[PDB]
């Protein structure tokens, strides 16, 4: 109901949009003359270390990660040792920039699936494009729903209007400016989230009511000592989640698009390392906010005796702290920081998915004669369509976090093993890749999603028949699936690639090219 909140938010939006358009105008005429087909997707192959590092740091830290870290820190049963998102992201980026992204940039690509369409073919590229698009779209939709909840609670305005205007801003961004605008707006929002998060903490910390975390950490508190141990019963599950965050974060058109624009491979790996450092340094505010929220005495605050953890409203602790433990003019800063992180992740995801589609699907499946113009038209139209679909998914999907998680498992199981095979383990043909993708899909689908009821059927040891009926299992069931898929891929690919010249084995038939 605060009229000045609308003023501040719209001023922020208009200013940063002006920055994005001012960035796009200069590089309107950039790259080669006939580079209109690929200027958007490639970024001119010339960005600095600073810009790329800031962009990647803003891309991974997109608000949803902040909320997840706060939840893992705050919710009882969880703990700081259960907040594997920051550490997972940091070591994922370090491993990426150290091992991968050297040969991905040294040769010179445009999208992720370039090795896929080079070694398997267009037929496999058009089938492997789906998981990345689905994952990016559901991630963006979940982050949008988070933004809507934050707005609808911090300000009295409804979530629909704010979500739709933010989506309109992102669509204008990825229409007008290809990659330079996204990068410069990423640096703007990264600074914004840094300053907002690190200015909203001390005011809440020194509240007269909340007990100091210097003691509210070890002995006995209202919620729980927020450290959080790993149960001897379940250490596999934590291993599985940690592995998923380490490895499933590597294959992503966001990071791959950022590395595919560095001026040189060395600058690309330094970009990845600096992005990891930035994620590490931006982790701390989320942990501090979680500690602040966990140490409160909610009865004597303005929220009331029913704690958020006791009202099933704990899914959004950070806005509660922002709007209750801090005054109005710092609550606005915190809300702006959250919105900026959301926009960074949203624009990165939309640009990545639309780039992948508009290049790889369109050029290599439908049209190659329209070499320059219709390609840029396809990118802009696809960006707009994906923005509209993001609006629809954010608006009318009650269960979107489950879709986000399911797409994360799908990517981490099907994309990473094939990417690793085509990069480091040569000799694999399309037969083994097809079989491994099929096996991974079967293992994921028949294993049963915890948040819906497609088919939760497995005799997996340690399956837990909880109250809602989702007999989920505590054994990893995800890393074992991915390792089985990768091993099956490599083994049968090698067996076929040798068997094709043995006997009546493939003397005549060739389902796909093998010689
Ligand atoms: C949660 O916080 C509330 C404060 O909003 C606590 O209420 C407080 O309760 C005590 C105990 O009754 C009140 O002290 C005395 O209350 C009587 C009425 O029963 C009154 O006639 C006396 O003059 C004296 O105030 C105290 O006033 C009250 N707080 C306020 C602000 O009025 C509540 O006890 C807390 N929950 C728990 C479990 O302690
Ligand atoms: C306890 N909950 C609330 C329910 C699910 O388990 C959690 O601990 C949780 C939260 C987030 C994730 C998560 C998984 C994948 C991804 C992602 O798609 C995001 N990126 C694409 C940004 C990189 C990593 O892959 C992000 C977050 C996984 C588990 C959070």
From Swiss-Prot:
It is a multi-pass membrane protein. Changing residue 103 to S: In CMS20; decreased choline transmembrane transporter activity; no effect on localization at plasma membrane. Glycans are attached at residue 299. Residues 1-4, 68-79, 145-162, 211-235, 294-315, 396-404, 455-479 are extracellular. Residues 26-46, 101-123, 184-189, 257-272, 337-374, 426-433 are cytoplasmic. InterPro entries: Choline_transporter (IPR052244), Na/Glc_symporter_sf (IPR038377), Na/solute_symporter (IPR001734). The chain crosses the membrane at residues 5-25, 47-67, 80-100, 124-144, 163-183, 190-210, 236-256, 273-293, 316-336, 375-395, 405-425, 434-454, 480-500. Coiled coil: none annotated. Choline uptake activity is regulated by SLC5A7/CHT1 internalization (inactive form) from the cell surface and recycling of internalized SLC5A7/CHT1 into the cell surface (active form). Activated by extracellular chloride ion. Specifically inhibited by nanomolar concentrations of hemicholinium 3. Optimum pH is 9.5 for choline uptake. Transport efficiency decreased at more acidic pHs and is abolished at pH 5.5, which should coincide with transporter internalization. Changing residue 87 to V: 40% reduction in choline transmembrane transporter activity; found in 0.06 of Ashkenazi Jews. GO terms for biological process: acetylcholine biosynthetic process; choline transport; in utero embryonic development; neuromuscular synaptic transmission; neurotransmitter transport; synaptic transmission, cholinergic; transmembrane transport. PROSITE patterns: NA_SOLUT_SYMP_3. Pfam families: SSF. It catalyses: choline(out) + n Na(+)(out) = choline(in) + n Na(+)(in). Its main location: membrane. It is linked to Neuronopathy, distal hereditary motor, autosomal dominant 7: A form of distal hereditary motor neuronopathy, a heterogeneous group of neuromuscular disorders caused by selective degeneration of motor neurons in the anterior horn of the spinal cord, without sensory deficit in the posterior horn. The overall clinical picture consists of a classical distal muscular atrophy syndrome in the legs without clinical sensory loss. The disease starts with weakness and wasting of distal muscles of the anterior tibial and peroneal compartments of the legs. Homooligomerizes at cell surface. Interacts with SEC14L1; may regulate SLC5A7. The C-terminal dileucine-like motif (DKTILV) controls SLC5A7/CHT1 internalization in clathrin-coated vesicles to early endosomes as well as choline transporter activity. This is High affinity choline transporter 1. It comes from Homo sapiens (Human).
């Amino acid at each position: 109901f605060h009229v000045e909140g609308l003023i501040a938010i719209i001023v922020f939006y208009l200013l940063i949009l002006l920055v994005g358009i001012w960035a796009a105008w200069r590089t309107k005429n950039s790259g080669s003359a006939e580079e209109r087909s690929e200027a958007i997707i490639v970024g001119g192959r010339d960005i600095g270390l600073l810009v790329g590092g800031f962009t990647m740091t803003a891309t991974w830290v997109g608000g949803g990660y902040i909320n997840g870290t706060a939840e893992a820190v705050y919710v009882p049963g969880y703990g700081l040792a259960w907040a594997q998102a920051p550490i997972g992201y940091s070591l994922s980026l370090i491993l990426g920039g150290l091992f991968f992204a050297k040969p991905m940039r040294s040769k010179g690509y445009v999208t992720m699936l370039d090795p896929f369409q080079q070694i398997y073919g267009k037929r496999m590229g058009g089938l492997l494009f789906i998981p990345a698009l689905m994952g990016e779209m559901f991630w963006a939709a979940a982050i949008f729903s988070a933004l809507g909840a934050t707005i609808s609670v911090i300000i009295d305005v409804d979530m629909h209007i704010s979500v739709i205007i933010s989506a309109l801003i992102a669509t204008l961004y990825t229409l007008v400016g290809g990659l330079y605008s996204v990068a410069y707006t990423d640096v703007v929002q990264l600074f914004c989230i840094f300053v907002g998060l690190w200015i909203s903490v001390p005011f809440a910390l020194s509240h007269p009511a909340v007990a100091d975390i210097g003691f509210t950490a070890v002995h006995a508190k209202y919620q729980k000592p927020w450290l959080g141990t790993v149960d001897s019963s379940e250490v596999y599950s934590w291993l599985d989640s940690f592995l998923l965050l380490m490895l499933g974060g590597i294959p992503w058109q966001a990071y791959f698009q950022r590395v595919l624009s560095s001026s040189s491979a060395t600058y690309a790996q330094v970009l990845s390392f600096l992005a990891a450092f930035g994620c590490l340094v931006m982790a701390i505010p989320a942990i501090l906010i979680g500690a602040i929220g966990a140490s409160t005495d909610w009865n004597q605050t303005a929220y009331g005796l029913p704690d958020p953890k006791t009202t099933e409203e704990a899914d959004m602790i950070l806005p509660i702290v922002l709007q209750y433990l801090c005054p109005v003019y710092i609550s606005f800063f915190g809300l702006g920081a959250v919105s900026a992180a959301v926009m960074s992740s949203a624009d990165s995801s939309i640009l990545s998915a639309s780039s992948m589609f508009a290049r790889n699907i369109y050029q290599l499946s439908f049209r190659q004669n329209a070499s320059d113009k219709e390609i840029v038209w396809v990118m802009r139209i696809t960006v707009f369509v994906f923005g509209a679909s993001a609006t629809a998914m954010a608006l009318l999907t009650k269960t979107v976090y489950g879709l986000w998680y399911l797409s994360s498992d799908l990517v981490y199981i099907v994309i990473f093993p094939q990417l690793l095979c085509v990069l480091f383990v040569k000799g694999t043909n399309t037969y083994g890749a097809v079989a491994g993708y099929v096996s991974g899909l079967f293992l994921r689908i028949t294993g049963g999603e915890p948040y819906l009821y497609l088919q939760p059927l497995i005799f997996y040891p340690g399956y837990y028949p909880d109250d809602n009926g989702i007999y989920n299992q505590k054994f990893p069931f995800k890393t074992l699936a991915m390792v089985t898929s990768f091993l099956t891929n490599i083994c049968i690919s090698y067996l076929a690639k040798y068997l094709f010249e043995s006997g009546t084995l493939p003397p005549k038939l060739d389902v796909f090219d093998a010689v």
